[model samples]
Target: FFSDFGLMWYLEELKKEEFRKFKEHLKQMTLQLELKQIPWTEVKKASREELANLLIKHYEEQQAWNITLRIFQKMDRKDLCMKVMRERTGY
Candidate 1:
């Protein structure tokens, strides 16, 4: 995740199916991370930018990144995971 971009970066970078799959479990994933849940009513109908704002509004940058990171890892997005560490470490 970019330090500034955070979860919003992944929102567009993630494939459509991947994004949908992640959103379907967004609440559970946050809970699993011992974080707050995004309201399903909004989540179900959220546009990409709206969702990104909601995510950071609730979770901030680091937590949002962690939550999104977990979803990507679950999806076996190793290259994506690697990209995070690579960018993160180089900075």
Candidate 2:
């Protein structure tokens, strides 16, 4: 049933759990995500969807997905990565 929601299924689940770390890692990804131009103060303590939406604003969805996969895919929770990452596994 969850898979029916697609990658966001795991993304939202993961977001609910450890997006703190996700945001932490996300902060370090300025260049990779091309977010160096923006001030971190604007994004810090923001929600996952908020930052993910920034990714969409700055880049393509699939590109954001791929870069996010590279970031989260290597973390402890990899099963979700495999499922969610299948899509942008490129643009």
Candidate 3:
């Protein structure tokens, strides 16, 4: 999935039906993962910046303000975070 359309503008192809299906798939996957009870300890050891990097990469792929805010909140790098906000947010 990443290799094929990672760089392509495929989100434009996602119409109403595809969007609904994609949202359902994501919702089911999230529920299943939560039910698995994956130990938070396994994920907690990484530094804030590392976790922030992961979140930024995964979430920022959509260029979302909320995603960037989540990453900045985790990392607590206010300077960079503000810079990103300034650059990303339309003046």
The candidate that achieves the highest TM-score relative to the unseen native structure = 1
lDDT of 2 by residue, 1-91 (tens): 3443433444576755476676566667765655544466655655655767776566667766766676676567676676654655852
Candidate 3 deviant stretches above 4 angstroms? 1-39, 56-60, 63-65, 68-82
**Candidate 1 root-mean-square deviation in Å:** 3.4
Measured with C-alpha atoms, the lDDT of residue 86 in candidate 1 is: 92
- What value of lDDT does candidate 2 attain over all alpha carbons? 0.61
lDDT of 3 by residue, 1-91 (tens): 3443221223223444543443343334435545332134433443333433443355454543353333334444355456556766964
Q: What does each candidate score in C-alpha RMSD? A: 3.4, 4.3, 14.6
Model 2: ten consecutive residues of lowest lDDT: 1-10
Clashing pairs in 1: none
lDDT of 1 by residue, 32-60 (tens): 76766777888867876788888778878
Worst 10-residue lDDT window, candidate 1: 1-10
Backbone clash total, candidate 2: 0
Q: Candidate 1, overall lDDT?
A: 0.75
